[PDB]
């Protein structure tokens, strides 16, 4: 898509104070603080009048909050079920692998709003394994259509494919 790329690139332009106030708004809707809504409006309004396709609003808000909290860099080919699974091969299959594996499968049966904390723990173990790159555009357009089961099964089969290799 040619609309989400501008959103991710504009997010990468954000300076320290803006993503600090985005960091402070974890688990909080974009209403109880005025500056957070102002920042989201500035990020989210001008990309609908230049390109016809835009992500969903809740996906954009959640992705902005998570991006502020973790601060990765955008790189093609680094979606969640590849780096996930790649880290699962670096594990003991007896005990820890079912633990981390269940932590990953918790994402596949959740709605967009409640995934903030499971995505937080998944990206926390990603940060523990020193992962710098994450395809924010790829994550965003597989998350804006997260409610159709073909993309969920494709994401899971990507995890399988990265695990068997």
């Amino acid at each position: 898509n040619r609309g989400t790329v501008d959103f991710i690139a504009s997010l990468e332009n954000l300076k320290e104070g803006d993503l600090g106030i985005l960091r402070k708004l974890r688990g909080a809707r974009l209403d109880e603080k005025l500056p957070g809504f102002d920042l989201f409006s500035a990020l989210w309004w001008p990309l609908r009048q230049k390109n016809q396709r835009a992500p969903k609003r809740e996906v954009a808000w959640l992705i902005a909050k998570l991006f502020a909290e973790f601060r990765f860099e955008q790189r093609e080919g680094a979606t969640l079920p590849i780096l996930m699974g790649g880290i699962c091969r670096k594990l003991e299959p007896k005990k820890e692998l079912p633990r981390v594996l269940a932590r990953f499968d918790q994402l596949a049966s959740l709605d967009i709003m409640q995934m903030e904390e499971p995505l937080s723990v998944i990206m926390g173990i990603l940060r523990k394994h020193q992962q710098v790159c994450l395809d924010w555009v790829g994550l965003t357009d597989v998350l804006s259509f997260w409610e159709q089961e073909p993309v969920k099964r494709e994401w899971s089969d990507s995890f399988i494919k990265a695990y068997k290799i």
Partner: protein, 368 residues
């Protein structure tokens, strides 16, 4: 005539029921995962509840000969009892046998000890087992009995063991997406050592959910299996109402003391029962205002509205009840002012439902 009893219970983080692997029970209701509590666990916990002790009169045992041998000071009859049972039809110490406790105790003791026969002794023991219907827990939960046809005698028969269940407990369906949570526990070794580690690193899974609990009484069946009397039937209905509102499943309560109480009672008298599972086909997602209990009650009251007008049964109206304690949780917050007798107690609703049952009172019936 049959009685519906509905509850909406929110519970603390707890594991009231597990499968073989230890996970809380789950069902795919409405295309999403819903937390489940098994009906048999609820039936057992209400059976073993602290108010059913005046009415707890059913035993489900395979050690019948042990029960005979306990009530005999010096007359050892445990091999003779075992062979009498083994040619009764049970083949081994046996399979599971349902009966009344005191009846089998005393009169199987008197019918077993006498040295008058061995074949007809087994036949009359089997007849005593089959006639053991004077117990209302058997009348509620139900019981059949199937002995073997191989390890038996051709001269031993069995009467019709038909007992219908007068209770249909539904499985407690969660009112939202189930969020199964993983608990990580260790076991401390009390004495120290070099390793400074745990005695047993283990797995436990717990689920905090607002359960839609649903029971149903077949009062007509409850008296067609408890003979012509109605006093014991009214006492059992009141005892179940008290027990269900008062007791909880005895799962991992020592580790999760979730003894929270039902935040909703809906008793409606009709000849066509209904579960409000379709009240929560849409998963309940909470908003910033109110809480999960209120949103669940709101969706339930919306469903009660369009099944009291769209599916209206004004030939037999609803006598829909509540347990809203001093009106803490009202039902009709926007339109549903059809709760005819919204109260804030439990003995009052017990007395009311036995009043529409017939001419009974709460205190007088509580003596059978």
């Amino acid at each position: 005539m049959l009685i519906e009893i509905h509850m909406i219970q929110n519970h603390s983080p707890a594991n009231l029921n597990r499968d073989d692997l230890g996970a809380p029970k789950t069902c795919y209701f409405g295309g999403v995962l819903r937390s489940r509590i098994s009906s048999q666990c609820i039936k057992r916990s209400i059976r073993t509840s602290n108010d059913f002790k005046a009415l707890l009169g059913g035993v489900r045992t395979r050690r019948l000969a042990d029960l005979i041998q306990q009530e005999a000071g010096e007359t050892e009859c445990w091999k003779k009892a075992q062979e009498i049972l083994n040619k009764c039809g049970f083949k081994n110490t046996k399979m599971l046998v349902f009966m009344s406790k005191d009846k089998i105790k005393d009169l199987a003791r008197i019918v077993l000890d006498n040295s008058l026969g061995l074949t007809e002794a087994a036949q009359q023991v089997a007849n005593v087992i089959a006639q053991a219907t004077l117990a209302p827990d058997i009348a509620l939960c139900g019981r059949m009995l199937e002995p073997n046809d191989k390890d038996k005698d051709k001269k031993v028969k069995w009467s019709n063991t038909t007992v219908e269940a007068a209770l249909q407990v539904a499985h407690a369906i969660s009112t939202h997406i189930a969020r199964p949570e993983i608990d990580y526990f260790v076991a401390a070794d009390d004495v120290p050592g070099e390793d400074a580690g745990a005695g047993h690193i283990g797995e436990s899974m717990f689920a905090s959910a607002c359960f839609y609990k649903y029971f149903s009484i077949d009062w007509e069946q409850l008296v067609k299996n408890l003979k012509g009397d109605t006093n014991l039937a009214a006492h059992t209905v009141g005892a179940f109402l008290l027990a269900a509102a008062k007791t909880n499943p005895s799962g991992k309560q020592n580790s999760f003391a979730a003894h929270n109480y039902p935040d909703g009672i809906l008793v409606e008298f009709k000849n066509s029962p209904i579960s409000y599972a379709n009240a929560f086909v849409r998963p309940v997602s909470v908003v910033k205002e109110s809480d999960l209990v209120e949103q669940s009650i709101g969706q339930l009251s919306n469903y009660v509205n369009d099944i009291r007008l769209g599916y209206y049964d004004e030939q037999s109206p609803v006598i829909g009840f509540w347990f809203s304690p001093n009106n803490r949780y009202p039902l009709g917050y926007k339109h549903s002012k059809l709760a005819s007798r919204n109260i804030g107690n439990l003995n009052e609703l017990v007395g009311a439902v036995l009043d529409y049952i017939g001419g009974f009172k709460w205190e007088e019936v509580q003596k059978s």
